[PDB]
Design a protein around this motif. Structure first.
Motif, PDB file in Angstrom:
ATOM      1  N   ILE B  13       0.739  -1.238  -0.202  1.00 32.35           N
ATOM      2  CA  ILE B  13      -0.030  -0.074  -0.073  1.00 32.35           C
ATOM      3  C   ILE B  13       0.961   1.320  -0.167  1.00 32.35           C
ATOM      4  O   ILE B  13       0.420   2.447  -0.244  1.00 32.35           O
ATOM      5  N   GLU B  16       0.391   3.713  -3.158  1.00 28.56           N
ATOM      6  CA  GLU B  16      -1.062   4.291  -3.307  1.00 28.56           C
ATOM      7  C   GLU B  16      -1.343   5.408  -2.062  1.00 28.56           C
ATOM      8  O   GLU B  16      -1.878   6.456  -2.092  1.00 28.56           O
ATOM      9  N   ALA B  19       0.495   8.501  -2.214  1.00 28.21           N
ATOM     10  CA  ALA B  19       0.094   9.361  -3.026  1.00 28.21           C
ATOM     11  C   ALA B  19      -0.873  10.584  -2.544  1.00 28.21           C
ATOM     12  O   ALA B  19      -0.858  11.845  -3.028  1.00 28.21           O
ATOM     13  N   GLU B  20      -1.545   9.818  -1.520  1.00 31.75           N
ATOM     14  CA  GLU B  20      -2.526  10.852  -0.839  1.00 31.75           C
ATOM     15  C   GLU B  20      -2.055  11.760  -0.179  1.00 31.75           C
ATOM     16  O   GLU B  20      -2.549  12.918   0.125  1.00 31.75           O
ATOM     17  N   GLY B 290      -3.088  -1.791  -4.416  1.00 23.93           N
ATOM     18  CA  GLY B 290      -3.558  -1.497  -5.689  1.00 23.93           C
ATOM     19  C   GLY B 290      -4.903  -1.596  -5.971  1.00 23.93           C
ATOM     20  O   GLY B 290      -5.343  -1.116  -7.198  1.00 23.93           O
ATOM     21  N   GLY B 292      -7.431   0.464  -4.259  1.00 26.50           N
ATOM     22  CA  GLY B 292      -8.155   1.792  -3.902  1.00 26.50           C
ATOM     23  C   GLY B 292      -8.769   1.447  -2.456  1.00 26.50           C
ATOM     24  O   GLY B 292      -9.624   2.500  -2.225  1.00 26.50           O
ATOM     25  N   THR B 349      -9.048   5.146  -1.004  1.00 24.28           N
ATOM     26  CA  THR B 349      -7.827   5.826  -0.800  1.00 24.28           C
ATOM     27  C   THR B 349      -8.098   7.350  -1.394  1.00 24.28           C
ATOM     28  O   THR B 349      -7.706   8.175  -0.756  1.00 24.28           O
ATOM     29  N   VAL B 350      -8.262   7.251  -2.586  1.00 26.00           N
ATOM     30  CA  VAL B 350      -8.354   8.620  -3.460  1.00 26.00           C
ATOM     31  C   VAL B 350      -9.483   9.351  -3.008  1.00 26.00           C
ATOM     32  O   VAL B 350      -9.194  10.601  -2.658  1.00 26.00           O
TER      33      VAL B 350
END
Ligand SMILES: CC(C)[C@H](C(=O)O)[C@@H](O)C(=O)O
Ligand SMILES: CC(C)[C@H](C(=O)O)[C@@H](O)C(=O)O
Ligand SMILES: [Ca+2]
Ligand SMILES: [Ca+2]
Ligand SMILES: [Cl-]
Ligand SMILES: [Cl-]
Lengths: 364, 364
Positions: B13, B16, B19-20, B290, B292, B349-350
């Motif tokens: 993780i 990802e 990225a946040e 991967g 989300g 996540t996004v």
């Protein structure tokens, strides 16, 4: 022929709960025709008071002349200020373990029916229940590694302990874990810090060597930080936990506390020769001493472990264990096992021991 | 003038959620006028895949040129069979700690409002709540003591690690615990094994020396087996827990898991000079990568710790923390924070990072 037991009740609740253990042992000696002779010896705080040290030479010789040690508990506020290396708990237990080569520590922790509500676990986790045996290596590792001490002065003064294991030491404790798993649910979880410790690398290696002798036992490895998380979360997934001295110290206690009922739990420390030291899992509880409140079940079950492991008296061991079960399922619970709205049903130490010796006598 | 950050997202993780964190950092850079420049470098499993080792020389030099490390997580089944001393987790984190003298590890664990039901504690214990800071010594003790290795062959082959502390090492970590307690609830609980370990004796001694500088902070000492029991039972009685490397490893994780919500928790590893490594408390969670699904809050709050501790950007740190609070109190929870009857409200996540960067932008 006739067994000899060194009775080392110690401090705090030790003597009152030992008295109950001995009462139950008396019922058992009568029922199975066992001739056990007992001598009491001071240990821990009462040995410092009576003799100047936590483990008098004569306590020690008394243990050498025994087939087993029936051990109570040691420690208390009165000695809780002394030099660490004169303090009663470590002063009694480590030289006892070291002298008699008690390399194997067994502490089974189970969540008892009806006592789920006492466990500090969330109710759905305690409802799942658990039954975890901690097999802890007791005479090596960092407790007894050398060099140990300190050098220097000032900022640069340093203190050191060496954590050490040999293949021989790891394999004999591993075998114990594996044989135990065999008669349980056939899983050993070996607990180490192999990502950090050279000892843990050899530990993990050797335990895998031992597993070849046990094609029927599942082996897994886990880090101690990970094991301690996972026991809070899913204690039901562990069967036998195999640990070194320092890790098993931590883990045994953690799991004991997850039961919510430590006063029901006992411990066997044994050498390869059948001799052991049998004690309750929980401390000497000096706040409750002399008041008739302590749960004697832990000490009573220590006696049962003593009979089974050292005295080869399996039948007598199981009679005591069934008498304890009988008490827990017949409203004979001391106060710390009762929810606060039920605490008025509380039995005293003496009542607990009377009932449990009576059940043995009655042929439970 | 302009800050430089080494971004070491790692495995699972890590990328990802990083990225946040970076999305939220972008909102914060804009709002407070901060000029932060970032370079990404491989670490852990992706560094073994891309470069042959968990900590490439160039990752390391990238860190030396940075004001802080924004660190993701490392480890995964794909490398979970390699020689322990080539494995990604220990291969990345210990040389990073050692090289940059990151002696101080801070992991605060709090039971968040509304998330009590997720904690593995019995509901009356989680209802009491808790807020425990683990201050863990990170660059000495048994992780980095020498001698470390093994000698011999056969049964008599032995492996060894030395646990070592100097007064200097203990006092600098103690001070951190004490200053932290000062701005919290003014209690330090120092956690050791002073009844067994020469290191723990010096540990307990030194920490008491340091306490003189803090007449307003209450100090108590506790054994690690005892501390781990007591945290399952009454986590609310601890404020700051001060531990050595091996004990704080165990304790930080235990307390993190008692929250029930590790995906909200972060960690600061710091040296005396202001440089640190900031990471989520929880692992790289390769089963959920991967998809989300991962909670980015831990990584987003790592960034906040980075801003406060290394970049002296207190205001920007607190804006992120309030944006996170805003999410948790406005129905923006990822799936692992939701009870199974509520899991349909789960944010990705996004979505979590979008909301939290938006809240910062909106002036939360
Ligand atoms: C008193 C102490 C030295 C002892 C140990 O660490 O072995 C105790 O914690 C135990 O569980 O027996
Ligand atoms: C991967 C491991 C070496 C590491 C440690 O023991 O420090 C980890 O458990 C941690 O909490 O950072
Ligand atoms: Ca213990
Ligand atoms: Ca850890
Ligand atoms: Cl050990
Ligand atoms: Cl350590």
């Amino acid at each position: 022929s006739s067994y000899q037991i060194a009775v080392l009740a110690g401090d705090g609740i030790g003597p009152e709960v030992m008295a109950e253990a001995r009462k139950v042992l008396k019922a058992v000696e009568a029922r199975f025709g066992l001739n056990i002779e007992y001598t009491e010896y001071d240990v821990g705080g009462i040995a410092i008071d009576n003799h100047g040290c936590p483990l008098p030479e004569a306590t020690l010789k008394g243990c050498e002349a025994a087939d087993a040690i029936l051990f109570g508990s040691v420690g208390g506020p009165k000695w809780e200020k002394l030099p660490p290396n004169e303090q009663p708990e470590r002063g009694a237990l480590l030289p006892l373990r070291g002298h008699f080569e008690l390399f194997c520590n067994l502490r089974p922790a189970k969540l008892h029916d009806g006592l789920e509500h006492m466990s500090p676990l969330r109710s759905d986790i305690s409802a799942r229940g658990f039954d975890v045996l901690c097999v802890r290596e007791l005479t090596g590792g960092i407790y007894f590694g050398k060099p140990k001490g300190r050098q220097g002065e000032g900022e640069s003064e340093e203190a050191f302990d060496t954590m050490r294991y040999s293949r021989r030491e790891i394999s004999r404790i591993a075998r114990i874990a594996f044989e135990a798993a065999r008669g349980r649910r056939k899983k050993v979880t070996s607990v180490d810090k192999a990502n950090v410790l050279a000892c843990s690398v050899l530990w993990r290696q050797v335990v895998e060597e031992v597993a070849v002798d046990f094609p029927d036992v599942e082996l897994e490895h886990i880090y101690i930080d990970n094991a301690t998380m996972q026991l809070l979360r899913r204690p039901d997934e562990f069967d036998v936990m195999l640990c070194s001295n320092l890790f098993g110290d931590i883990l045994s206690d953690e799991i004991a506390m997850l039961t919510g009922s430590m006063g029901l739990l006992s411990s066997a420390s044994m050498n390869s020769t059948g001799f052991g030291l049998f004690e309750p899992a929980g401390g000497s509880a000096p706040d409750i001493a002399g008041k008739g409140i302590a749960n004697p079940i832990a000490q009573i079950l220590s006696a049962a472990l003593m009979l089974r492991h050292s005295l080869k008296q399996e039948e007598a061991a199981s009679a005591i264990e069934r008498a304890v079960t009988k008490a827990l399922n017949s409203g004979y619970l001391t106060g710390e096992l009762l929810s606060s709205d039920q605490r008025h049903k509380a039995k005293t130490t003496v009542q607990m021991g009377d009932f449990i010796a009576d059940a043995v006598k009655a042929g439970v």
